[PDB]
Amino acid sequence: KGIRKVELAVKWDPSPPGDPATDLDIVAATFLAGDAYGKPAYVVHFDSRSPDGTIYLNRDSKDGKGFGWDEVMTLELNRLDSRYARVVVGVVIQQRDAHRTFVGVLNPGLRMREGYTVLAEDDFGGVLGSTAATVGEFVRDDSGEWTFHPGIHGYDSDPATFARVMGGRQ
Ligand SMILES: [Ca+2]
Numbered sequence: 001k002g003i004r005k006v007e008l009a010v011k012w013d014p015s016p017p018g019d020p021a022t023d024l025d026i027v028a029a030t031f032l033a034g035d036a037y038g039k040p041a042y043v044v045h046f047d048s049r050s051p052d053g054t055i056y057l058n059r060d061s062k063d064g065k066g067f068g069w070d071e072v073m074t075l076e077l078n079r080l081d082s083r084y085a086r087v088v089v090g091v092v093i094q095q096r097d098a099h100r101t102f103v104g105v106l107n108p109g110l111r112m113r114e115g116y117t118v119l120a121e122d123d124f125g126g127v128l129g130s131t132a133a134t135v136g137e138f139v140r141d142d143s144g145e146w147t148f149h150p151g152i153h154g155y156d157s158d159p160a161t162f163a164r165v166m167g168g169r170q
């Protein structure tokens with residue numbers, strides 16, 4: 001693809017007053033060249049900074065209150081050390097307060113772009129029964145160029161489990 005820098009943005013509307021809050025989190029995982037579909041080298045989310053500052057959450061929301069994009073993450077893929085050959089991005093729905101799948105989130109949406117070029121948009125309509133989803137993959141070849149592989153894949157897991165398994169091959 002020749003992808004250099006990606007922004008992943010996610011939006012949703014809040015739960016009704018008095019219901020448990022709806023909280024989606026963006027998470028990214030990096031994988032090593034010698035194990036691209038295996039154990040994450042590290043993960044980035046609202047409670048876990050990148051060790052190298054190249055992938056970072058720009059803003060979060062714990063309730064979806066607010067017009068426009070509620071949570072945004074930047075991935076400076078060009079700057080990743082060559083040891084990293086694959087990055088997976090995903091969205092989890094927090095489960096601690098209530099079992100909630102994408103159909104139970106009001107008007108969820110995502111957008112991924114490189115600069116001003118939109119790469120993907122989705123409403124999670126293919127994963128309505130899931131509690132988390134991977135929403136995109138980037139793979140770097142021997143030429144050094146990052147390719148984006150679209151695809152939304154649903155998971156039935158909670159956030160902590162998802163972060164460990166989100167690299168699995170599809
Ligand atoms: Ca959140």
Ligand SMILES: [Ca+2]
Nearest residue numbers: 012064066070
């Ligand atoms: Ca919102």
